[PDB]
Amino acid sequence: QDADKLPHTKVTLVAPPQVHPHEQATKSGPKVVEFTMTIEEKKMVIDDKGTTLQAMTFNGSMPGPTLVVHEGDYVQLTLVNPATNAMPHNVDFHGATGALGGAKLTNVNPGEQATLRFKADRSGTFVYHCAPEGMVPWHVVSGASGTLMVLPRDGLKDPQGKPLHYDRAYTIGEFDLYIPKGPDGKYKDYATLAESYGDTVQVMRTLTPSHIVFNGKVGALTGANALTAKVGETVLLIHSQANRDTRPHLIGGHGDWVWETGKFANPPQRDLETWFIRGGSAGAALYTFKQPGVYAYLNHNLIEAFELGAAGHIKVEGKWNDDLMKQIKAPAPIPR
Amino acid sequence: QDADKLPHTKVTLVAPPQVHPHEQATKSGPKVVEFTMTIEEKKMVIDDKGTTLQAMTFNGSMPGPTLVVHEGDYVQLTLVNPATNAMPHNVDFHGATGALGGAKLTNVNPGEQATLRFKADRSGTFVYHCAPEGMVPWHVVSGASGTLMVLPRDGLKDPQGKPLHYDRAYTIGEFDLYIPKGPDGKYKDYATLAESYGDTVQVMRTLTPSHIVFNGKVGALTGANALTAKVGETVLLIHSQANRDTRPHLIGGHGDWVWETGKFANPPQRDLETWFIRGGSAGAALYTFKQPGVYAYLNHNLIEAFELGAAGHIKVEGKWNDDLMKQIKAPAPIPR
Amino acid sequence: QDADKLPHTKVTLVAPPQVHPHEQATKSGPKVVEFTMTIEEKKMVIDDKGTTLQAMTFNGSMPGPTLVVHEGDYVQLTLVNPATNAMPHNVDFHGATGALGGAKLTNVNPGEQATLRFKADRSGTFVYHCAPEGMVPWHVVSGASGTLMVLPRDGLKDPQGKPLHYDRAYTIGEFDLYIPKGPDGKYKDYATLAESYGDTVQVMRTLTPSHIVFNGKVGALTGANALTAKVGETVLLIHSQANRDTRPHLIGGHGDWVWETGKFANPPQRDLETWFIRGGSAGAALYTFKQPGVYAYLNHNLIEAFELGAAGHIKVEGKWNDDLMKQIKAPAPIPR
Ligand SMILES: [Cu+2]
Ligand SMILES: [Cu+2]
Ligand SMILES: [Cu+2]
Ligand SMILES: [Cu+2]
Ligand SMILES: [Cu+2]
Ligand SMILES: [Cu+2]
Ligand SMILES: [Mg+2]
Ligand SMILES: [Mg+2]
Ligand SMILES: [Mg+2]
Secondary structure: OOHHHOOEEEOOOOOOOOOOOOOOEOOOOOOEEEEEEEEEEEEEEOOOOOOEEEEEEEOOEOOOOOEEEEOOOEEEEEEEEOOOOOOOEOOEEOOOOOHHHHHHHOOEOOOEEEEEEEEOOOOEEEEEEOOOOOOHHHHHHOOOEEEEEEEOOEOOEOOOOOEOOOOEEEEEEEEEEOOOEOOOOOEOOOOOHHHHHHHHHHHHOOOOOOEEEEOOOOOOOOHHHOEEEEOOOEEEEEEEEOOOOEOEEEEOOOEEEEEOOOOOOOOOEEEEOEOOEOOOEEEEEEEEOOOOEEEEEEEOOHHHHHHOOOEEEEEEEOOOOOOOEEEEEEEEEOOO | OOHHHOOEEEOOOOOOOOOOOOOOEOOOOOOEEEEEEEEEEEEEEOOOOOOEEEEEEEOOEOOOOOEEEEOOOEEEEEEEEOOOOOOOEOOEEOOOOOHHHHHHHOOEOOOEEEEEEEEOOOOEEEEEEOOOOOOHHHHHHOOOEEEEEEEOOEOOEOOOOOEOOOOEEEEEEEEEEOOOEOOOOOEOOOOOHHHHHHHHHHHHOOOOOOEEEEOOOOOOOOHHHOEEEEOOOEEEEEEEEOOOOEOEEEEOOOEEEEEOOOOOOOOOEEEEOEOOEOOOEEEEEEEEOOOOEEEEEEEOOHHHHHHOOOEEEEEEEOOOOOOOEEEEEEEEEOOO | OOHHHOOEEEOOOOOOOOOOOOOOEOOOOOOEEEEEEEEEEEEEEOOOOOOEEEEEEEOOEOOOOOEEEEOOOEEEEEEEEOOOOOOOEOOEEOOOOOHHHHHHHOOEOOOEEEEEEEEOOOOEEEEEEOOOOOOHHHHHHOOOEEEEEEEOOEOOEOOOOOEOOOOEEEEEEEEEEOOOEOOOOOEOOOOOHHHHHHHHHHHHOOOOOOEEEEOOOOOOOOHHHOEEEEOOOEEEEEEEEOOOOEOEEEEOOOEEEEEOOOOOOOOOEEEEOEOOEOOOEEEEEEEEOOOOEEEEEEEOOHHHHHHOOOEEEEEEEOOOOOOOEEEEEEEEEOOO
């Protein structure tokens, strides 16, 4: 399977929370799958009170888009750092072997680009992130991470080897942010990326985030921007956290089959109320919806979710099933 | 198994750390099991220096009592909010499917009551807690959570399918508390529940608890109130944490068989020194005692346990076994 | 297997990060394995800016040395507290059953020594630490912990029962330190151990460490003191944390087979990017190197690793394998 001789294809990446089209089980043999990504430095609004962040993102989103291949395929990435950026960047893929995950071979300054190829020989969801020498934590907490999903060639399996399949996949990236506050107790605003550095590092050292958000901002996946599904659909929820632990939960649901450490050759666990994604990794859960209504998907440290921002919504269409749950007596006066 | 036609029974709930009588493996078929609980708002003393908390509890205890049923049974709960309370409450069962775990169908104001029924179709220990719209974190950290244990109809099993059985079950609820301190560095005391709100939320946002207690207060399960057992007994230790991670350990023991994510259809792990309960869940461990003496059961972040309060005792009767452990030479002068 | 009749041998302990010579699978039957350790109170330099810590260590190192036996063997330890120390100490082995892990039978004051024997009947890596009544957290965070590895008599196994073997073993101890800072924002220095107490306990209660180090100091295992291996070697990485959670990761590698809860009778997980060691435990991972170069081994909360100190290096000799990873186009000007 020399690589140079296998066929090559090109994927067109989409923005979170969707994932690009792909097949679960494939008949095909190894390919070289080609992708391109641009780093974008930009100032973004992260809450509803106008707080800003001097951010660093892959393709302009938080998280960066999810890339999907099959086990045995070769990933061939072109990383582009445009001249309007001010800093150098690179990429570390946790799914790759050697060279600090690719970081040593992808150091690009503003105005440069580079291309790397690596064999994706282990299946699972894996984090990728920016990692420049001496500036690692700051480039990651500023937004630069995302997920690489490597499917087993024959699709996902339960513990006895039976096939599992999903109808839809969503990708959630969770970000712990360290926004400095001034003498007045109001969040600071910075003219450039470099100006933010000094103060940010000071908040970082306290280990206490100011905000924790899904996909870029408080409320990113709530109300009008809720994820959607229907009764009877099976959804794959991919959740990444490149720096800090989190504990996802679906209020009104469960994780039917969950790979919390995110590595598909291991058997999944079933019926979980709440699962655990270790900082520096991505995990995955399947759930088949049985009841319609609004569901909340969140980090079940409820202060982190409701005070700091780690909460989203899934709106589901269908018909109520009164056997699973039914109101016998609505709220009413106690009997006197 | 329409529900309306199955037989119905009524359980009488007891206070932690005990659990109400129940059977492990049952011959019976699905029932509708009926329970009733009252919410009680009250001011409680949480340490030995007189610190107080404006608390919200199910049935007046922290945690709320454990409810036990078998897989396939239907839980039918009556939730009662007496007129002496000041706020509205509800309940979210993580063992239920739909309607935000039951929260949408149980919103009761002071002086009202409501009844919900749901099918318990997944086995394991599951957290339940209060969850009112816009006030979630505060009602949970104030004390309102507990555990629902759903046993598999044929009892608990080891990984090769062999039967496991316990002689006694205890339930431990761990609570992270955020009690405000004043200019003097002394804990504040509040006349009403509502008066405490503003300051509490400020301590919460720091993510640093003032106290972490088992079952309501520092020393709740120590010295005279230790849990009890005897050499040769097999105990089931149920441990819940509705908001924050913890890591239980038995000094001088192990977890023989442990379900850390708390879901009985998965195989347990064996011989654990320390296990991990994710915030927003309940887990379970079995241990058979082999040596008499005092054992400490605690959160093995030792600052959390010894400085903040997360430590209890188990006193065990029986005969010392010198093969497992023996003192060869007692403490004595080094040889000169 | 009365103990008094089995053969007895004596092991000679070495300093971290190495582990003393031992066999994986053994033909032998139960022995009484004898070890001796001295507690040493000493002031040590923990970073590169001269910060000091008033430390308490087993045999003068952080962590204490790893002790290795086989399942069914009896551990016989002599603990020695020299007259130049100021405090009393003891030891709690998480691998032992009864007497608070041995703590009640090993209380030695300066100038005394004691000998304990316990049966090592459960396999896995287990933490040991000092635990004196009323002073537990402080003696542990000051440096007094290490690992006891109990191998299964027939060596380590994969999940289908196939044999796994390693060529080299390293031991990493991770320590969260709470060094007080003064009005000037400079770290305090203390003349004696007892003088440090009062202030340390105050930093501890904030739950926010000032430093988190591998093996004693920032940079202990970096650059010139990197761990070493070669392409084709299989290494066993043992990682202990007696007080706080951590999440290890090998940049450019994976955990081929990992026991995160560290208990060898359970099947390992494979292909992990990042794993989780619960505070109060030790875990183990195997990895076979496939590419030469420098690898970083660290806690993947990247603030904890790069700002606070939890990062080390592994330098590996061998020949680059261009199929796993290859640079297609080096960094260069974007095309105009
Ligand atoms: Cu960058
Ligand atoms: Cu990384
Ligand atoms: Cu409430
Ligand atoms: Cu919940
Ligand atoms: Cu000590
Ligand atoms: Cu311990
Ligand atoms: Mg994980
Ligand atoms: Mg859990
Ligand atoms: Mg562990």
